[PDB]
Amino acid sequence: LHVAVSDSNDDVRRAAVIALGFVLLRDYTTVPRIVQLLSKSHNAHVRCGTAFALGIACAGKGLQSAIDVLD
Amino acid sequence: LHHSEKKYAEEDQVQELLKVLNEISKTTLTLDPRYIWRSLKDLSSLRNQELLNAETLCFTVNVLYPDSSSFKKNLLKFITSNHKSSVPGSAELRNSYPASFYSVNTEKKTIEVTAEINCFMHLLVQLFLWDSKELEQLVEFNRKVVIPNLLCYYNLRSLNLINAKLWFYIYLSHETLARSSEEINSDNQNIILRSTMMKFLKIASLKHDNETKAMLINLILRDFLNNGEVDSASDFISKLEYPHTDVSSSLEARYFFYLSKINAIQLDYSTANEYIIAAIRKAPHNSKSLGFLQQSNKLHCCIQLLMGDIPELSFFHQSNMQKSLLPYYHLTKAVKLGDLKKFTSTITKYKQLLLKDDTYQLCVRLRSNVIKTGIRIISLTYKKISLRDICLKLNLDSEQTVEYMVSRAIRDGVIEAKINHEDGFIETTELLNIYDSEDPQQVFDERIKFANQLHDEYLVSMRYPEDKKTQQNEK
Amino acid sequence: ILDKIFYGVLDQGNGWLYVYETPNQDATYDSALELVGQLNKVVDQLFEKASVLY
Amino acid sequence: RVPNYEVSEKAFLLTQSKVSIEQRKEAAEFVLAKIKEEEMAPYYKYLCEEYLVNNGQSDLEHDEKSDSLNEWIKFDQELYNELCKKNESKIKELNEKIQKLEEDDEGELEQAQAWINLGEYYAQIGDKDNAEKTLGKSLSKAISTGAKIDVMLTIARLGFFYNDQLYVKEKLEAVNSMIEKGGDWERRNRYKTYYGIHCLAVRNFKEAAKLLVDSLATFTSIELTSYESIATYASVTGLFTLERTDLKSKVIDSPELLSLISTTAALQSISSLTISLYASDYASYFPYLLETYANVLIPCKYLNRHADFFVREMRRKVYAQLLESYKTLSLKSMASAFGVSVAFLDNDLGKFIPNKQLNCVIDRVNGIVETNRPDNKNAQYHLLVKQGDGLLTKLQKYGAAVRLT
Amino acid sequence: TTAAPLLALLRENQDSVKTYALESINNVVDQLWSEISNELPDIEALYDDDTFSDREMAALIASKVYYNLGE
Amino acid sequence: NNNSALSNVNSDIYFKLKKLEKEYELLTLQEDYIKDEQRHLKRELKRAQEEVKRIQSVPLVIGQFLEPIDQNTGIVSSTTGMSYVVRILSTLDRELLKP
Amino acid sequence: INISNNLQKALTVKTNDELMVIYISNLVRSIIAFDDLIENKIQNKKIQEQ
Amino acid sequence: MSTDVAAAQAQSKIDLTKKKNEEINKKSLEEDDEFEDFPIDTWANGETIKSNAVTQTNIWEENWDDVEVDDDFTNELKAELDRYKRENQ
Amino acid sequence: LSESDKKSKLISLYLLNLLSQNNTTKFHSELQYLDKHIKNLEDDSLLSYPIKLDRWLMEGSYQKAWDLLQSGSQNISEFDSFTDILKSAIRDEIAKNTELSYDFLPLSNIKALLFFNNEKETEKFALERNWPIVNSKVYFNNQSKEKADYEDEMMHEEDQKTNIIEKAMDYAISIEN
C-alpha cells in the first residue's frame, strides 16, 4: 500500500495493487473496501491494477461486491 | 366499567411492548434505541393514572407471567383491589404476540423472551409507585423483588440499557421515606443501598455499559453528601471512572453539581466554580428543569462571593426565580458594602431559608469576605493610605487589627498590596504592564488549544451518523 | 489636551508637561475587532438555518 | 386630545415634594379649573389612585393625612354631577349619527369621523380604554392611510396622559408597522416626537438623543408637550450620551437651541451646565447641577427615575474629563475648582472609582490624585481578548447541541 | 456507616487488635471501597511482614479495592 | 419460554470471533495508510494548481467574452477576428462574467 | 499569535457550517428511507388488484 | 438569569420529547422545585426598597440606584458647607 | 450517627484535634458531616469554640485567636492539651503572611506580631526562617530571594512555562494532522 501511494511511476503503482489479492487470497471479502479508494483514483495506472487484483482475488470463491466495483 | 377502560388502555401497552422488543432483538445501536425508550416513558406515566389502574394486571395475565402476577395484586389492594376482567379466559391470550410467541412455541419450549417481558413489567411497577405517591411498605416491597431478578439473567448489554433507567426510581422512593419519617430502619438499610450500587457498578464495568455506569455514579454521590461526609465522595471521584459515551444533558449537568459542592467546602473556589458554570450550561432551560436551575443559581452566587468577586444586579432582577434568590441578592449587597452588622442580620433573618437549602455553611466563610471585599475597594480607590484611616472605615479598634487582616488577605493575593509599617501606610502593588511581560504568548496558547478541541469534536461526530445512513435503504 | 492637538498630560503637583505623539490604537487592533464582531453574527445565523434539526 | 399633555404635567408636580411647594399651589389652581371645564373627572379618579399617600390627602372622599402640603386638592361629588350631564347629551347625539350614516352609502368615512369624535371626547375626560375601542372602529373603516397612522399615535398619547409607559410601547409598536405603509414623511416627523419621549423614559438615551434633536431641526412638537420642553430634553440626553468632542457640535451648536434662547428656568439650568463643561469652569458646574435636579429632572415624568442617575453621571463625566488631561493633580486644587473640599472629594470619588469610569487613585499621605488610565497596548488587549472569548463561548455552545442529538 | 472506625484500628498497634481489624474490613471489602482506600499502605505492610497468619487476608483487601480503582 | 444456551456464546468467542478481532486490526492498518493518502493528495493539489498558473501568465491574446452557451463553456470572439468556442477555467467569476 | 488565535477560531466557523449541512443531509436520507417502505405496499397491492 | 449568555444557553438547550423524561427525573432528585417551598413560610415575600429607589419592577433596564440611595441632598449640603469653609479660610 | 451523653464535649475535641494537625481542609470537610446531626438538635453550645478559632484565622484576626485560646483555660478540663499546639501554629501562619507584607521590618515591630515576651524567643524563630537580624532589623528580603533561586534550580519549568519555539510546533502540526 505504502509503495502504491509513494512511488509515482506507473509500473510500480500498477504492480503493487495487483499484488495485494495474492496476499489476501483467503481474505477476499475485505479487499473491495481496501482498494475502494484506489478504484476511485485520479491515476489511470492504479485503476488498471485495481481491476486485475479484484479478478484474481474473487476468482474461485465468488463475491458480489467485486463484480459491482468492476462495473 | 371494568372491561371498558382496561381493554382501551391495554391497546397502547401492546404497541409499547413491541417498540422495546424490535430494537433489542436486532441489537442496539447504543444511543438511538435509548432515546426512544425515554420518549416511551412520557406516555406511560399518563396512561397508568388514567383509565383505572388494573390496566397492568389485565396485561400481566395476557403476557407470560412466571410469578409477576403475585407482586401486582399486592400493589393493587393498597389503591383499592380490582380483579374482574383481569382473570384468565377474559384477559388471557397467548396469541397476538411475537413477544411470547404463539401458544404452540410456549408449550414446546423455546428461547427466553420472558427477560424483556420482566424488565418491561418492572418499568410499570417503578412507574406505579411514583405516580400514586405511595409510601411506606411499597418502597421495601418493590426494591427487594426487582434487583435479584436483574442478576438472574446473563448480564447482557441489551438488557442492561433498559434496566438502567429503573435505578433512578428505586433510589427516589428511598430518600422520600427517609425525609418523611425519622427511624432506625431507614438509617440501617441505607448501608445496604450504597453497598448494592457499588456491586452493580462492578458488574457493569465487566460488561462495559456506559449508561449503567453514569446513572449508578450520580445516585450514590448524592447519598454521601446528604449524610454530609465529604471524604467518601471525594475519594470515589478521583478514580476517574465517569463515562462520557452514554451520558445525557441532564446526566452531565448533575455530575458537575456534585463536583462543585465538594470542592467549595474543601476551600478551593476556583475549582468549584469551574464545575458549576458547566452544570448550568449542559442543562436545558424549561419549567421542567426549573428545580435544577433554581438550585444551580443558589450555589453559584456564593461560590463567586467566596472568591471576593461579586455577581451583577441584572442577574437577580431579570430572574423569574428572583423571589427565592432574595436572601442571595442581600448577600451580594452586604459583602460589597463591607458592613459587619448587615451581614450579622441577614444570616440571622434568613437563617431558616439558608439552612433548608444547605447553603448556610458557605455563608459562614462569607463573613470573612465582608472585610476582605471592603479592604479591596479601598486598595482600588487609594494607593497610599494611613493605617488610621482604614481603621475608621471598617470600624476596627487598633492599628494592629488592620495589619493582621491585610497581611493574610495579600497572602491570598485578593487585595494586591504590600504593608509599609516603616512609614505607616499601605501601598497598592498593582502596576499592570502585562503586555510587557512574557505571559501573553502563554494566554493565547490555551485558546488555540480549545479551538483544536472543537476541530476534533466536529470531524469525529459528523461521520458517526453518516455510516449507518449510507447503509440505510433508499430510492 | 481636550482638543487633542499634541495630546499630552499635565502634572499639577510636580508642575510638568508631558507630550505624547505615540499612537493609541493600531490597525491590527482595529480590524481584529471588526472580524470577530462579524463572525459572531455568522454563528447565530448558522444555528438559525439549522432549527429543523430538532 | 389637545389639553392632555399640559394637564398631565401639572398634576405630576403635585405628587412631588422634592420641588418648591410654591410651584405646586400655582399648578393646583390651574389644573383644577380645567378639570371642571373639560370634565376630566375619570382622569381625576385615576390620578388619586396613583398618588397615594403623597397627595390627595386633603380630599373629602379620601382620608386626610399630613402627606399632602396642598389643600387646593379637593375631590368632590360636584364634579360627578356635571359629568353625567355633559357626557349624556353629547354621547347620545353621536350615537344617533353613526346609525344615520349606515343609511347613507359611502358611509364608511362618515362613520369613521364620528367614531373619531367619540374617541376625542373619551380622550378629553380620561378614558384610554374607550377611545381605544372607538378609534379601532375608525381603523377598519375606509379612511386615508395617513389617518390610520395618526389614529394610532392618538391612542399612544393616552398612555402618557395616564402615566404608564408600558401601554405606550405597545401603541408605538403598531406605528412602527404602519409607518412605511403610508410612506408619509408627514407622519414620520410626528413619529420622531412620540418615540423620542418614549426613549427618554428608557435607560438607554442613545435613541433619544438622535430623535429629540430631529424634533428640534424639523419643527414638530405638536399634540405633545411644547417646543421649549423638546429643547430641554435634547440637552439632557445630548450631555449623557455624547462625548466632549461631539458635544459642542451637536448641543452647544444647534441653530434651534440658540434661536429659542432660555426663557424658561428648566431650559436655562441644563444649558448652563453644558456651557461651563466646555469652557472648563467647574466651580459653576456643581451649583448648576443642583439647578438641574430641581427644575428639570424631577419635574419631568421620564427623568424622575433617572434624576439620581444623571446627577451622578455628570459628576463622573467631568472628573474623568480632567483625569484625561492630567497625570497628577492634588486633592486641594481639584477639590477647590469643583467647589467641594478634600473630605467631600474623597467620598464622591469613592463611589465612582468602583463604578469603573475614572480609573485613578487617591493618596492621602502625599495627597496627590494620580491617573491610572491606559490608552496604549494594555487597553487594546483587555478589550479584544473579551470579544474573542465571546466567540469561543458561542462556538462551544452551538456545536454541543447538534452533536448531542 | 463509616469505615473510619475500622481504619482507626489498622493504625493502632498490638497484633491481637490488628487481627480483629483485618477481619472487620474483609466482611465489607466487597461492599465498600472508597472509605478504606487511604490505608492501603498500612495493609500492604502487613502482607510484606511474616509475623502474621493474616498476611493472606491483608493482601486480599488490597487487591479487591485496587481493581475497583482501575489498577 | 425461559432459558437459552450459554455455551452457544462461549464457543463463538474463541473460534470465529478471535479471527474477526484480528480482521479488525487489518482495517485499523487501512486507517494508518489513508491518513498518508489524504495528506499525499493535498500535496498533489499544490502541484495541479501550479501548472495551471503558467497557462494564466503571458503571452495572452485579447479577445472579448460575449455570452455563455453552458456554465463551463462560453463563446468569445478574438481581436484576431475569429469566433472561438472556449472552455472556461475554474477559479473565476461566472456571475460577473456573463455580460 | 493574537492574529493566529483568531484565524484558528475563524476556521471553526467554517467547520461548524459543514456539521450542520451534514446533519441536514442525514435528515433527508431518513425521509427517503421511510417513503420507500410505504411504497412497497402500493406495488404489492397493485398485483393483487389486477 | 444564568451563567454566560443566558439567551445563548436557552437557544442551544431546549426541550425535546427525548429530554422531557430526563428533565423531570432530574427535578425530582433536587426534591421538587424548591421555589414553592419558599412562599409558604414567608407568607408572601415583599419587595426590595431598603436600598433600591427604582426598585425591581422597572419596565426599562435597572440602574445602580438599586444599591445606592438619594445622594442629591448630601450634594446640596456639601456645597453650602464648603462655601463657609472657603469664606473663612 | 451518635446519641451520647458526652456528645457535646467530644465533638468539641473532634474539631480542635483537626486544627492541631494543621489541615483546615480536614476541618471544613468534617464540619459539613457534623452539621446534619446538630441542625436543630444541638447547634452551638460549647461547639462554638473551634468554629470561632478557624474563622478568626481565615478573617486574619490573629489578635483575637490568641485571647480566645487562653480564656478557654478558665473552664479547663483538657482544653490545655490543644492550647499548646495552637500557640505554635498561630506564629507560623503569620510568618507565611508577613513574607509578602515587608522587605524589612524592625525587631521591635515583629516581636509584637508573633506574640513573644522576650528577645531569645524572637531571635530563634527568625533564624529558622533564615531572616537575618542586623542592628535589630529583621529582613524578609533573604527568604524571599532564597526561595526564588531554589525554584529556578529545580526542573518543572520548561513545560510549565511553555517554551515559545515549542508553541509554534504545536500550531503547525494540528493543521497538518
CSV table of N, CA and C in Angstrom, one decimal, chain D residues 268-314:
chain,number,residue,atom,x,y,z
D,268,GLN,N,-33.0,76.8,31.1
D,268,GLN,CA,-31.8,77.6,31.5
D,268,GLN,C,-30.8,76.7,32.2
D,269,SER,N,-31.2,75.9,33.2
D,269,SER,CA,-30.3,75.2,34.0
D,269,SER,C,-29.4,74.2,33.4
D,270,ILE,N,-30.0,73.4,32.4
D,270,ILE,CA,-29.4,72.3,31.7
D,270,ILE,C,-28.4,72.8,30.7
D,271,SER,N,-28.7,74.0,30.1
D,271,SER,CA,-27.9,74.6,29.1
D,271,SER,C,-26.7,75.2,29.8
D,272,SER,N,-26.9,75.7,31.0
D,272,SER,CA,-25.9,76.4,31.8
D,272,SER,C,-24.7,75.4,32.1
D,273,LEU,N,-25.0,74.2,32.5
D,273,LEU,CA,-24.1,73.0,32.9
D,273,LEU,C,-23.3,72.7,31.7
D,274,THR,N,-23.9,72.6,30.5
D,274,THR,CA,-23.2,72.2,29.3
D,274,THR,C,-22.1,73.3,28.9
D,275,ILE,N,-22.4,74.6,29.1
D,275,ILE,CA,-21.6,75.7,28.6
D,275,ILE,C,-20.3,75.7,29.4
D,276,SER,N,-20.5,75.5,30.8
D,276,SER,CA,-19.5,75.5,31.8
D,276,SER,C,-18.5,74.3,31.8
D,277,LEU,N,-19.0,73.1,31.3
D,277,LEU,CA,-18.1,71.9,31.0
D,277,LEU,C,-17.1,72.2,29.9
D,278,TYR,N,-17.5,72.8,28.8
D,278,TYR,CA,-16.6,73.1,27.7
D,278,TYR,C,-15.6,74.2,28.0
D,279,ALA,N,-16.1,75.2,28.6
D,279,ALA,CA,-15.4,76.5,29.0
D,279,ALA,C,-14.5,76.2,30.1
D,280,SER,N,-14.7,75.0,30.8
D,280,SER,CA,-13.7,74.5,31.8
D,280,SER,C,-13.7,75.3,33.0
D,281,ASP,N,-15.0,75.7,33.4
D,281,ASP,CA,-15.2,76.4,34.7
D,281,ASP,C,-16.0,75.4,35.5
D,282,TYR,N,-15.5,74.8,36.5
D,282,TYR,CA,-16.0,73.7,37.2
D,282,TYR,C,-16.6,74.0,38.6
D,283,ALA,N,-16.6,75.3,38.9
D,283,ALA,CA,-16.9,75.9,40.1
D,283,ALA,C,-18.3,76.5,39.8
D,284,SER,N,-18.8,76.6,38.6
D,284,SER,CA,-20.1,76.9,38.2
D,284,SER,C,-20.9,75.7,37.8
D,285,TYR,N,-20.2,74.5,37.5
D,285,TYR,CA,-20.8,73.3,37.1
D,285,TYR,C,-21.6,72.6,38.2
D,286,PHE,N,-21.0,72.7,39.5
D,286,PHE,CA,-21.6,72.0,40.6
D,286,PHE,C,-22.9,72.6,41.1
D,287,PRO,N,-22.9,74.0,41.2
D,287,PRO,CA,-24.2,74.6,41.6
D,287,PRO,C,-25.3,74.4,40.6
D,288,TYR,N,-24.8,74.3,39.3
D,288,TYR,CA,-25.7,74.2,38.1
D,288,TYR,C,-26.3,72.9,38.0
D,289,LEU,N,-25.7,71.9,38.6
D,289,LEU,CA,-26.1,70.5,38.6
D,289,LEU,C,-27.3,70.4,39.5
D,290,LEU,N,-27.3,71.1,40.7
D,290,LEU,CA,-28.3,71.2,41.7
D,290,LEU,C,-29.6,71.9,41.1
D,291,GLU,N,-29.4,73.0,40.4
D,291,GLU,CA,-30.4,73.7,39.5
D,291,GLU,C,-31.0,72.7,38.5
D,292,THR,N,-30.2,71.8,37.9
D,292,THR,CA,-30.7,70.8,37.0
D,292,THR,C,-31.7,69.9,37.7
D,293,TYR,N,-31.3,69.3,38.9
D,293,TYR,CA,-32.2,68.3,39.5
D,293,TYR,C,-33.5,69.0,40.0
D,294,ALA,N,-33.5,70.2,40.4
D,294,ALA,CA,-34.6,70.9,40.9
D,294,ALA,C,-35.6,71.2,39.9
D,295,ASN,N,-35.2,71.7,38.6
D,295,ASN,CA,-36.1,72.4,37.8
D,295,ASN,C,-36.2,71.6,36.5
D,296,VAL,N,-35.6,70.5,36.2
D,296,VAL,CA,-35.7,69.8,35.0
D,296,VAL,C,-36.2,68.4,35.4
D,297,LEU,N,-35.2,67.6,36.0
D,297,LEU,CA,-35.2,66.1,36.1
D,297,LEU,C,-36.3,65.5,36.8
D,298,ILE,N,-36.5,66.1,38.0
D,298,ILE,CA,-37.6,65.9,38.9
D,298,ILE,C,-38.9,66.4,38.5
D,299,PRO,N,-39.1,67.6,37.9
D,299,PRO,CA,-40.4,67.9,37.2
D,299,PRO,C,-41.0,67.2,36.0
D,300,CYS,N,-40.1,66.4,35.4
D,300,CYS,CA,-40.3,65.6,34.2
D,300,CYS,C,-40.9,64.2,34.6
D,301,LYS,N,-41.6,63.5,33.8
D,301,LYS,CA,-42.2,62.2,34.1
D,301,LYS,C,-41.4,61.0,33.5
D,302,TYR,N,-40.2,61.2,33.0
D,302,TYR,CA,-39.4,60.2,32.2
D,302,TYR,C,-38.0,60.3,32.7
D,303,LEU,N,-37.5,61.4,33.5
D,303,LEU,CA,-36.3,61.6,34.1
D,303,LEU,C,-36.5,61.6,35.6
D,304,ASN,N,-37.6,61.3,36.1
D,304,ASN,CA,-38.0,61.2,37.5
D,304,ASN,C,-37.1,60.2,38.2
D,305,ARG,N,-37.0,59.1,37.5
D,305,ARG,CA,-36.3,57.9,37.9
D,305,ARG,C,-34.9,57.8,37.5
D,306,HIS,N,-34.5,58.8,36.6
D,306,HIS,CA,-33.1,58.9,36.2
D,306,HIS,C,-32.5,60.2,36.7
D,307,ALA,N,-33.3,60.8,37.7
D,307,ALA,CA,-32.9,62.0,38.3
D,307,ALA,C,-31.6,61.9,39.1
D,308,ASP,N,-31.5,60.8,39.9
D,308,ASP,CA,-30.3,60.5,40.7
D,308,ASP,C,-29.2,60.0,39.7
D,309,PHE,N,-29.5,59.3,38.6
D,309,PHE,CA,-28.6,58.7,37.7
D,309,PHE,C,-27.8,59.8,37.0
D,310,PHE,N,-28.5,60.9,36.5
D,310,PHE,CA,-27.9,62.0,35.8
D,310,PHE,C,-27.1,62.8,36.8
D,311,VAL,N,-27.4,63.0,38.0
D,311,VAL,CA,-26.6,63.7,39.0
D,311,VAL,C,-25.2,63.2,39.1
D,312,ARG,N,-25.3,61.8,39.3
D,312,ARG,CA,-24.1,61.1,39.5
D,312,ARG,C,-23.2,61.0,38.3
D,313,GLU,N,-23.8,60.8,37.1
D,313,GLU,CA,-23.0,60.5,35.9
D,313,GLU,C,-22.3,61.8,35.5
D,314,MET,N,-22.9,63.0,35.6
D,314,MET,CA,-22.4,64.3,35.3
D,314,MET,C,-21.2,64.6,36.2
